[model samples]
Target: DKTVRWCAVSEHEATKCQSFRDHMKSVIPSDGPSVACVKKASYLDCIRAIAANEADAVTLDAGLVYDAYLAPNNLKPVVAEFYGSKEDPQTFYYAVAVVKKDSGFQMNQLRGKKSCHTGLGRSAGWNIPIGLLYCDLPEPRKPLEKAVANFFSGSCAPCADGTDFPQLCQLCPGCGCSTLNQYFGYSGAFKCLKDGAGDVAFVKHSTIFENLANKADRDQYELLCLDNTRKPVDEYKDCHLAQVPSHTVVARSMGGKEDLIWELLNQAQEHFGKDKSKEFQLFSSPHGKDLLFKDSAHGFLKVPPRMDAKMYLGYEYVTAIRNLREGTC
Candidate 1:
């Protein structure tokens, strides 16, 4: 039995899953088979799954985990994602709300507007974007119970459900580029988002692009899925994966199966090419990513060029919701 089964963080799953799985089988042995489950997920669940040991390992980013609420902390990640370059633009990005090639939906457009996440309260679902959308509005759902929510809610558009996510928010069918929440359910999510509610349902097992995009009407429209980016896109062809070196997975349990899996993964990296190899880390230490940014931009840098709002709405919301809402604003 040489099955190297595991769950992986969302973004990197597509980028590494198949290659990792195939390589494990090729090098492990002709005994049984090797299987790796690198499906897309909310990440909070992935961390929970591995920490609970329902799975042996998972893909993860460090900073995202620091904010993650894990108990007893019983999981170890193997950092060393093999992307390409492993630099700023290649690494971090916010979930951008895009529209049909350039429908001109800018930051102000999002001001006081209703927004969403599959489930907020976690990092990627809420924090990642709220950190960007902050200043202009409150977190998508969160309550007055949160200091982060109180500060921003008054300024930005509040969720219609008046709570957290998945009420007025809606869950997406994971796959392709954007989830169904942003694509298929656009009609329900927002009426102003005219070109949304697209016709595409992604099947988890059918594709790979660490940053793949899909469309039922490719000729008609396209939009961003969600990003953890620190900066904006300068090139259309460059596939940007929200990256944080701390987000790289590094394992601590080393012995029988661990050693075998590690060696096989390195071998697989050799197959994916140095460009991808440099992006993937086999043993990343926090020191390896010492240069990653920590701006937590708020809304100052959201693209489409210029509007003025504060930064990291959740921070403000939490500050206020927690009883610190008495600033000189």
Candidate 2:
């Protein structure tokens, strides 16, 4: 094959994946299939591209991956990014609520607090945390955004429909109160707290560690444990609010070259694993953290050939997400 297209979900990712494509020519020059790192505006667009056979695969947030499995796309995970031990591999990470040391807020006191979220429907930053805290309320199924608006004094839900529901847009730094905000995703959510834009932030357990440079900065924040309590940032293994699945590389369930995709990733990781190269690391990004793949990911874990999204994501995680999807949020 002369050309193979890969989905690039964001501008930065498009740039990086294209760079990898250019580099691959040198890595396997003998008969390396030309890489086509195709750019799309969002994850949904990438999924649509795969469904229409316009692109091959792209790394996706677990939430987006779930979306792929549900609709007309019928995509499957070909490789999983293992978050923990290799011998006993873990496919999940913890969702955590973070607050400053001086904030002195408990889990129950989240009401009337200013909040920051990675995105409106994201796993760690929204669904898991909101499901845990707000699901038992009077109108659990409907008005979650309103419930959230009423609870938090203000928030920056980047993906919220700001014009339709203005309250959710109160804290967004964006001009239009949407994903246009630079402070919108993982690093953006943390920046909302670091820059004093919000009182608390919902993000993954590793976010604080990934964004912080030194111990002193890390110590300034703490994770809100589920038992209406708090613990140091490093104690997330025990004190986390919820354990959710990790992101993965999704391919069209049928007519997708699963083995060829695996080898491409395998070769890329071997040549550009984090420590392997200083010039162009596969997992690192300068302008935006996690531009393509998660910056924290060490390498890829080839999933079994037959595993579909449901089997790969497990029942509990899927159930939780489905509840959220059905809910009127």
Candidate 3:
């Protein structure tokens, strides 16, 4: 009852995150719940673990949060990410199309190019952007998966299979086309672009700064504007394709230690926040980025009491997601 098992996305993070758990134990002593890191190969594994009680909680992207809300295991979103200024307290960020500065490709000129996406069901990297493509295609009745496959000559959409959705995985760097692919998540998507395997990468606005913070300035990249023009990477706020709801920290809807989990998170941020850490920074790391939670998060907000995923993400975004996912067998 005292041990809190949290899920992590990869082995590299799992090992380091375990140390973070040990550090929390040292700081809180008798009052601190024992922290445990349950390493899963992928986010989907973590989601399944939380649902089956193999794990307690995991931070989720908005699109995956929607999938978690559907059949099998209905999860609850217990916390929302807080970012931006203390005075404004923004909850969301823009979803943008990132391309090399001199690609000479406008938003409308993407035919026969390669694309990189965080994952099939991810928010900024998949749903919003692909949903837009689905809405605008000349053949509205074409399956989104098919339309996307035809539009982009090749793409690295992790979680897609070459045997089933070959076009989606055609450009993937790794084999099998699932989470096993190294180029499958936010970092992976950007890495695809960095390696010149893809012409455009769909990701959140801060991806470049987070991954390439030291190697290159964002000036080396550009954002594909909605008006079919391209602009500097910094212009995302004005030229973004869509604004998505923030990511959430989710847990099992039944028999879950929601209160105790929050206690650890709220207290940990106080003891290990961006400015509060000396030994174990909770938000950023030299070993790995986005260990337990996103490095970009400013803090966490307790979900309104009794709020479920549908309520937290709102109706419109959920609807857009449903349409994008419809008819994909």
Candidate 4:
């Protein structure tokens, strides 16, 4: 029988992958491929390994999906993580600029403000917002990071450390890219805003509600619309930077072994998906947030045939990412 190799980026994720492998032994049918776990230092390395056939698959954010689609890697998304219910089955989320109601600023007034971001290269936090703002710059000669550093007075963009830009990491408490930094990820970025560390926070639309359970607490914040207006956080559907596709499990573009991969995921989810098993949950991890897949995800959805990374990520998003690199000065 064939073995599907999963590339894990971190130690915890590798551990979770091993658990997945062990659990799959009993759950996977005889026709389905057996599971194998591989460890890589980062998602980029995982992409290279998968392209070289050293590994078969890795789950990646939409931003990395764009990177993987470029040139030599040539990966395609075979499976998607769906956070919505089975009846609705949504495969996307909204990226929004969140600010305190009293901040008195619209989307256009974001310049020179202190900002908080989920991470440096994440989809909602970095790519969507920066990609939108970068193209609009009157003179975008500098690299994306440099341009962002100059745009904001200070920022807590984790994973931006070791760069030439000091201001990008100035507001981060731990000043590291990983979860070690308190002001990282969706909730953390909102905490950065709640604690008054930043004037605006770039996060997923659900972040405010996730962090602030009370309606009153959530009401203290508002979303900055692209039309240069401020709206209630719930209006994110109408006012957002961009609607990004969900993260996906990527494999080599040609002979990605997608059939085996899909079968494996389908069978595994049947036995381990969301409350299906208490022994080993497919979506949740005790050690970390978003290990193999998002903790919030309800289940996996098979992507349509011929849907490569470019098609999965959408035309506008791909263009935005490209513009960030081209620097339309």
Candidate 5:
């Protein structure tokens, strides 16, 4: 009997996975792989579990995909998540720096400013923005966090709290990485700027529009372009910091069941994708925003053949993330 064991990082995700498994019981072909769920304390643990062969797969963000690429894990992305319609599935999004329209500061003048970030180590919120800024710094020897702390007078970059850089979390009321921290994710980081808690917020291009339903309210915010100019929020295409890859389902590089995983996901999407099913939605959960897969994802796409984590993340992004690593200089 073949089985595909999926690693879930949270109790809620495990619950969702169980429901998915129960539903799959009636649909999986006799010769197809059956589904199972493995609960882990964290995504990192899930990565380790998959690497050690305790689990078969787990979905990961680009940042975590890079982590899985590092030595000892060597994972590969077999399936990619897309957000646009199936006919024109978009596998990427733009990371943008946003500020009040009248903030009067250019991207180059961010020193001594208060900033907000989605969370430490996130793609749009941290990696892309920090990577860009780190490239401009003269001293490459200083740790990335220390350089960021010195660059911004005070800020809230959740998950960075309790680190040596207390200044990084000075403006954070929740002061922790968990959901308890009101400034933890895209919406939360945008809320930081909306409430005047930060001078600038680093988030995805869609963040402002997603939070501010009114165009007038969104117009009050502008994007800080890399060219040292600012533009209206709607101009994110021309003003974003960088275009980041979407999240993916990663499995061990050696003996990774890429084909079987794809087969299962393809079938799952057909039955549960979008509004296809009333019984169980594959991409969403009532428990939380993103459970096993991104709630925003329209469907899954097979990653190009032989595309490992590094290739999937691309050279520029890989370099940027590597540059921020401790002891990288």
Candidate 6:
């Protein structure tokens, strides 16, 4: 191996991680010298610094790991989260359109309606919901304009029916709810509805269930599924691309930092998991309960460290995007 440079990270990280530094100072190095923990702003920034060739190793979220590995294949992403919570939700839910139960809205019946999101640019809450909505809609690429201009009874609920969409809003061929407009962020859809802000709201189905399943002494809201023609992204697990947790520390493979790196990593894991840490736990997978820094890099459902990125198919999407851009796909 090569001689590991203990403090070869951004100056910022070096100053901030005093505890890590102190621990390193206390331990004898695996290579007969103490190892140092490099500092950076956030864990993600730390990985980014490593990718930029500023640091030797870093732990990142699995999703980001796939992103870095597959995007350019320069740096490897380690599937490890620093101080990550035990409840790492894997199977995520998406936005759903809801209408008043008495309004009699049907998924297939909706042709034209308006919609809104808190705002897509604001956050992933909106963007993720939009991605799912697009996946759910039959004409995946079609814009939301055509759907907002008809008599589907329910339209995107920004304005009360007949107030904004007079002709279409006042007259309904049939009583049914339909997807109209879609916003790509989260705010208060339920609260918005109660205030009569809109007719329907685009929100996560799980949230809708928890908050709006029943009304006070009456049926108020009903959840609508994405059109059947569109398949959920999860159906074809391989094709779906998402940023997962990172497990592998990205370091210069042939450049340096081989010695004492893994050892220090293991030490950190031990310190965190030990009773002394007091409620501080290292990141782990549900299936194996593998520690992030325990010197055992793991992957999907308990794969070995090396297989984490592969099992997530980060490399595959990277390949697909490359081919598509190259026009050979």
Off by over 4 Å in 1: 1-3, 8-23, 29-46, 61-64, 67-69, 86-105, 112-125, 138-168, 171-195, 198-247, 250-261, 272-329
- In candidate 1, residue 240 scores what lDDT? 25
**Comparing candidate 4 with candidate 5, which one achieves the higher TM-score?**
4
Candidate 6, position 25, lDDT = 51
What global local distance difference test value does model 6 have? 0.38
Per-residue lDDT value at 35 in model 3: 78
Tell me the TM-score of each prediction against the true structure.
0.46, 0.91, 0.92, 0.86, 0.85, 0.39
Q: For candidate 5, lDDT tens digit of each residue in 1-329? A: 46789998657778889999988777877886668999986677888999999999998778878988788988889999998788888999889999998889998888888999877888988888777777555464376777788888888988674458888898895456533566766767888888999999998876776678899888788999989999999999999988899989998888888788998888889878999988899977776556788767899999999888888888988888877785343
For candidate 4, the 10 contiguous residues with the lowest summed lDDT are 173-182
Residues 30-140 of candidate 6: C-alpha lDDT, one tens digit per residue: 444344455543344554565566666654333334445544335543223332223452322234555555544455544444343332211122233333344334442
Model 3 lowest lDDT segment of ten: 173-182
| Tens-place lDDT digits, model 1, residues 1-329 | 55555665444343445545655565556664466664535455555655554554543433344433224443443433433343432333323332344544443444433343323332233444445445544543234224333432221122223344222322232221212223211122222233343221111111111223433333333434433222222222332222222233322232324544454444544443333344333232122111111112111111111111112122433343223223222
What overall lDDT, based on C-alpha atoms, would model 3 receive against the true structure?
Answer: 0.80
Identify the candidate with maximal TM-score. Answer: 3
What stretches of model 4 exceed 4 Å from their correct place?
29-32, 135-140, 173-182, 327-329
lDDT of 5: 0.82
Error of 2 at 22 (Å): 1.8
How many residue pairs collide in each prediction? 48, 0, 0, 1, 0, 34
Residue-wise C-alpha lDDT for candidate 2, range 198-292, written one tens digit per residue: 98889988898888979998988888888878899989888988887778888877888777788787888888876786667888866467777
Query: By the TM-score metric, which is better: model 1 or model 3?
Result: 3
**Reference-based lDDT, residue 131, model 2:** 81
* Model 2 spans > 4 angstroms off: 84-89, 136-143, 173-180, 327-329
Which 10-residue span in candidate 5 carries the lowest summed lDDT? 173-182
- Cα lDDT for residue 159, model 6? 22
Over 1-329, each residue of candidate 3 has an lDDT whose tens digit, in order, gives 27778987776678667877888887886966667889887778888999999999888888989988876988889988777754676799889999998889888787788999988788988998887776445454355666787788889888765576688887774433233466766777888898999999998888888777653566788889989888887777887999998888888889888888788888888888768878888778775656667778888888888898988999999888877767342
Of 2 and 3, the candidate ahead on TM-score is 3
Q: Cα lDDT of all candidates, in order?
A: 0.34, 0.78, 0.80, 0.82, 0.82, 0.38
